[PDB]
């Protein structure tokens, strides 16, 4: 029940490359050596649970 979209500017580093989206954008930019950033914008979904147990959410 909300939504927000945020651009991207930092190339990042290899020692932090363990959360899913930064290793996705780095892995996508290992090839195609004209783009670096400012073209891989980042949208912020916010899931909310109106129920009574945990869910696993891929």
């Amino acid at each position: 029940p909300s939504m927000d979209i945020i651009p991207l500017n930092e190339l990042f580093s290899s020692q932090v490359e363990n959360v899913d989206w930064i290793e996705y954008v780095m892995s996508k930019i290992r090839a195609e050596s004209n783009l670096h950033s400012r073209d891989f914008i980042l949208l912020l979904l916010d899931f909310r649970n109106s129920w009574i147990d945990g869910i696993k959410l891929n």
Partner: protein, 251 residues
């Protein structure tokens, strides 16, 4: 009347009080003895400072200045050593002693010995964010301490209430560029763009019902002083008050 001395004290409020004395050469006294020195064929003076000491004036006390000092001797110069005080709460103006020992010089003899001591009071005297309504004081339990490396991290907004309906309010970050001498337009645009796009706040409308964790990720570098954007909002009309506090370098 050979070496003018002054003490400057600066009030570092997040630490001790810092006060530094400063020796100088006193030019209106140097041309005096320069006249008789070049009468005796000497270009500049050779005053030797052999025992310089600041003592904490009390019934009896003494301190030690916050770096190292040798036994030095200079011609036409100025030196300034710094000693750390203790940052008082309210209304106790401390005093110091500041003794010194200038030893003059002549042709390998006739060292006319001098000494001086000017005792005076060392009080020049020129992070809780209060709610400004009902003393709902906020303080981060680790403010101004964060060397992140574009990783996740957690902070702690320890809210302190009246303990009278203590479940009221919601945080949020407002990732939106605020809508604002043409380079005064551009510096405000770069400030408002790097504020509203550099960090994310992974728990957005967290709706706190008295600690919090507030995980961020922080996707651009640079020293973010004062961490703006991170507003709260409360049961009344608009308690849109800031935190105004906490900082993080991100490299």
């Amino acid at each position: 009347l050979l070496n003018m001395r002054l003490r400057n004290i600066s009030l570092k409020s997040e630490h001790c009080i810092l006060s530094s004395l400063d020796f100088q050469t006193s030019k209106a006294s140097e041309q005096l003895t320069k006249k008789f020195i070049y009468p005796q064929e000497h270009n500049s003076f050779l005053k030797l400072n052999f025992q310089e000491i600041s003592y904490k004036l009390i019934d009896g006390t003494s301190q030690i200045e916050l770096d190292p000092i040798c036994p030095l001797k200079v011609p036409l110069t100025a030196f300034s050593y710094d000693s750390i005080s203790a940052t008082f709460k309210l209304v106790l103006l401390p005093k110091s002693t500041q003794p010194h020992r200038v030893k003059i010089t002549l042709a390998y003899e006739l060292e006319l010995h001098p000494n001086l001591k000017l005792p005076v009071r060392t009080s020049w005297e020129t992070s809780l964010v209060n709610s400004k309504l009902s003393n709902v004081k906020f303080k981060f339990i680790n403010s101004n301490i964060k060397v992140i490396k574009g990783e996740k991290f957690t902070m702690r907004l320890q809210i302190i209430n009246s303990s009278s309906s203590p479940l009221d309010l919601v945080v949020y970050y407002n990732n939106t560029i605020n809508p604002i001498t043409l380079e005064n337009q551009y510096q405000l645009h770069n400030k408002y763009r790097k504020i509203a796009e550099g960090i994310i706040l992974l728990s957005n409308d967290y709706k706190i019902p008295y600690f919090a964790d507030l995980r961020f990720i922080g996707i651009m570098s640079g020293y973010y002083g004062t961490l703006s954007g991170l507003k709260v909002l409360d049961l009344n009309t608009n308690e849109l008050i800031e935190v105004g506090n906490g900082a993080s370098v991100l490299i």
